[PDB]
Design a protein around this ligand. Structure first.
Ligand SMILES: O=C(NO)[C@@H](O)[C@H](O)[C@H](O)COP(=O)(O)O
Ligand SMILES: O=C(NO)[C@@H](O)[C@H](O)[C@H](O)COP(=O)(O)O
Lengths: 556, 556
């Protein structure tokens, strides 16, 4: 594998196995009061500021220089240009990777197969804008002349999570927009519970699917249409209640959706990087097209930052290299994402997909099997809730867990004259301070003695109240969570994921395991029908299938 | 350190040290046709069956024997009886651990440092039922003589996640009950968007706090009362719209809720183990008291299973020891929980707290600092969705990740003649089969060769299409997800967590990390007031605070 054979990686590795064990955050701050200044980055987007404070990390100037030298020797910049220039860096599927083109507000030409893709990107965007206009203004009428009150997005994975997370994060900006619903799981409960609340006369279904063949989505789509026609009664009416977001005109046709009602994207648009495309139709319908264009602009701003800033001051690069540091040097399996914002309740989940589906690989672009760690397990929940739950393990467990704490300075709901947000911010700050500082044995025993504890009680309870600290965190603070800032934040992490993938020399844009999954259920599905036992698989699969058929009858 | 000194543990490590790496699942099955029958257990609860299939784990007869031997030399059984007998096993807090008492429907005596607790346990339960009957029937009236249509639960951590997860899971049994809402985050957005949909006249608030001093809960509670009074008046009417669940009678009164409307629990009721107590009121209110009793009955059955079953066939113990195996011998940092049920969308999140807040510790009950790993990081999202996302990493990443796949045989919504559930079951089965089997280079080669690829391209793509497999999983299948079964499943995991803690000799029932957090931001909160810079903390905390002050009034 490329990484292990790299001299910069070896130098960093040797340094860590020579000093790593010795790096204490509390000590570092106590010996360098310019630390914050030296390990923090402030970005002024002219539409809000974003402060990336990475000073609470187990690093020194020597460590950062070695990490950036690695980014350089691993060719991050050249790879970055290849992506922005439309080169087919997705080597296994031989495709370009152009989500940056989707939000290329500057309209600078990007050539693929001898053709600028921007004209087509803008054509779809204009079509989306015209459609949303019609729907929102009430011009688009259902089969009975009523305006559309509900929009239902049917899709899964990359055709679901992005729009779900963004519409949730941007709720404050959806005034004058129809209600938006997201159905994704094949589990019947999802679509059934959704349909139960809808009126077919005023509901518009959006079938999101790059391929338009995914089993969960097509099956949900058919159930929706069947449900609809139970009222409509004229397939000529579905044209007024069903539209498609896809790249496969053929399939959309077979389903019963004529063009003009198909908003397309392209193969260089990865599913987990597709919310910026026609896939974001539900977003635009929810918050309006101006806000949707703001989202795109925020992403474009971050793309430009990533492309023009020297590595040492490049946000996504710094985030990516600190991650490489914890993953490949400290051996940390996970990465926690902790937004202190309820609207971002699906943010961690979104990047759980974005990061893991991209870098959960073990084969390099040269075909060699990696002999080092790659993508981490990403998780988290919106604080503060976590503090009263899993934070216990982050503070006093046996695992090192790098955490990204995020929060907006200004809230969308300054109720009680800002009291709630004041408390939220204080907790945000105090948590990373405590993770860094911890609480020594002397400090703990002091409190216990002041509490008047007997020598007996203090002795047995003292160890349990000590916090070793030295747990690294990043604090990302932005002025306000607007469509623009959100877009820049999502783009920031997309590029962090990109940089790590380049350093590991893997292809962060294919998903063979996901592709495989879409073809596994195939064989067992028909075998579940009969009531006769199955014996064609290993004994576990057989036993589970037979327990299934047996309990199918059970009358509980 | 205590587990380190155990001979059974040493035996395990030595065996694995030179053998726990050759264990290949596919090989184990292709040499033992009775593997499924020998490595699985079927539990008939009389209200549905539960199949725990742990045959797809990297274990052999020998290994399970050694694992069970370790369980007994560490005193699991002794520790268990101590818990059920009311002994104060929560050493650091010298408190009993009796969530089992809450659902002890056999009413068998459990003397607690004096008198039997059941009489009081059943007293609250009766009071709870009485209250529910009044609210659901229409007896309990709003100050304007209106019937309750919305119930809002306000609490955080253990006073929030349990009732939220259960009411979501048992939604199909909520016919007739009012709508339930859960507010927990101090983030003003949470209470704001919740109250914006309510009508003060027909809304009843439940303030859930064991101590009734938690800043988040108390503050949200005060804000709720405020919202209510600017639509009515006379702080007396509050009595008709606010009730409390706590152990602190007095401080609950100085708020505005007479002890009349207070449903108490006790100190031996851990927050993360409290949904079975008064904390579960929102559950009883949503699905009725008969269903709530079914839930308790379910947990009670599992408790008896755990208490009377020989270790070799004990569900919670088997799950626990398999976990110890992966954590302490294979070094796996995480445990994934993948329910194939939309209703269980908050299930993984529930145990993320239950497990991590319990076993995320590093100090033994003897005061010694652990010499090994403890509590893993728990995470997950419902199936099939994850298959289109993070499963990529489970299948082809560089981390070993034990996964628990769960699914009900019978769906609550058999739409399209069961087509959706048939597809859901097929994926459930196919995914674990695939994680175990993988796809060899040879198999992938033959598929690509047939596909028409040339030596050039086939070679280029081949390694990327190979699945090493040997990914261990547990498949837990139950007849139907009913109140009773949900109760049994939750109790099963509580005991799994209990067993692991004992083996590690830690205290799974205190939370000094969580206790520290509920006092961390207090020093920073006041410093946020004003526009003057702070210099009292480390440069990072100072820097963040100053950036917030500067941006708080920046007009974007
Ligand atoms: O590629 C992926 N993620 O990046 C996957 O998550 C796809 O987005 C998901 O399987 C949906 O595929 P279709 O849009 O073709 O229905
Ligand atoms: O102990 C805990 N979990 O087990 C914590 O998660 C508590 O449940 C949470 O802090 C709420 O405490 P109060 O009910 O006193 O408001």
């Amino acid at each position: 594998a490329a990484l292990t054979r790299n001299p910069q990686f070896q130098k960093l590795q040797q340094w860590h196995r020579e000093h790593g064990s010795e790096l204490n955050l509390r000590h570092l701050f106590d010996t360098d009061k310019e630390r914050f200044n030296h390990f923090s980055l402030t970005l002024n987007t002219n539409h809000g500021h974003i402060l990336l404070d990475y000073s609470k990390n187990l690093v020194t100037e020597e460590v950062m220089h070695m990490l950036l030298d690695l980014a350089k020797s691993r060719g991050v910049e050249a790879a970055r240009e290849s992506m922005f220039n439309g080169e087919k860096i997705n080597s296994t599927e031989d495709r370009a990777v152009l989500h940056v083109a989707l939000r290329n507000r500057s309209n600078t030409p990007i050539v693929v197969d001898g053709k600028d893709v921007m004209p087509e990107v803008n054509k779809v965007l204009d079509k989306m804008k015209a459609f949303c206009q019609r729907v929102r203004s009430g011009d688009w009428k259902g089969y009975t002349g009523k305006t559309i009150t509900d929009v239902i997005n049917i899709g899964i994975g990359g055709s679901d999570l992005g729009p779900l997370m963004v519409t949730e994060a941007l709720k404050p900006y959806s005034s004058g927009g129809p209600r938006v619903w997201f159905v994704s799981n094949i589990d019947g409960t999802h679509i059934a519970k959704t349909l139960a609340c809808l009126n077919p006369e005023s509901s518009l279904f959006i079938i999101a699917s790059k391929t338009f063949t995914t089993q969960e989505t097509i099956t949900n789509a058919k159930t929706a249409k069947d449900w609809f026609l139970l009222s409509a009664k004229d397939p000529s009416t579905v044209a007024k209640h069903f539209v498609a977001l896809s790249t496969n005109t053929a399939k959309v046709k077979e389903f019963g959706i004529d063009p003009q009602n198909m908003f397309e994207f392209w193969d260089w648009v990865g599913g987990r990087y597709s919310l910026w495309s026609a896939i974001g139709l539900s977003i635009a319908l929810h918050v309006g097209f101006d806000n949707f264009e703001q989202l795109l602009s925020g992403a474009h701003w971050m793309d430009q930052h990533f492309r023009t800033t020297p590595l040492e001051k490049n946000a996504p690069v710094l985030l990516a290299m600190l991650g490489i540091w914890y993953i490949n040097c400290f051996g940390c399996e996970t990465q926690a994402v902790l937004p202190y914002d309820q609207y971002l309740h699906r943010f961690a989940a979104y990047f759980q997909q974005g990061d893991m589906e991209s870098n959960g690989k073990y084969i390099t672009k040269s075909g060699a099997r990696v002999d080092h760690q790659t993508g981490p397990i990403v998780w988290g929940e919106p604080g503060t809730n976590g503090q009263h739950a899993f934070y216990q393990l982050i503070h006093q467990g046996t695992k090192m867990i790098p955490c990204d704490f995020l929060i907006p300075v200004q809230t969308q709901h300054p109720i009680r004259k800002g009291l709630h947000h004041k408390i939220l911010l204080a907790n945000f700050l105090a948590q990373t301070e405590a993770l860094m500082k911890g609480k020594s044995t002397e400090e703990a025993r002091k409190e216990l003695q002041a509490a008047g504890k007997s020598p007996e009680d203090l002795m047995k309870l003292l160890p349990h109240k000590v916090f070793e600290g030295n747990r690294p965190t990043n604090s990302i603070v932005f002025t306000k969570l607007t469509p623009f800032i959100l877009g820049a934040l999502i783009a920031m992490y997309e590029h962090k994921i990109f940089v790590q993938g380049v350093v590991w020399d893997i292809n962060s844009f294919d998903q063979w395991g996901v592709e495989l999954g879409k073809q596994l259920a195939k064989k067992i599905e028909p075998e579940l029908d009969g009531s006769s036992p199955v014996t064609s698989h290993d004994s576990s699969t057989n036993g589970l299938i037979n327990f299934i058929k047996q309990q199918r009858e059970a009358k509980i």
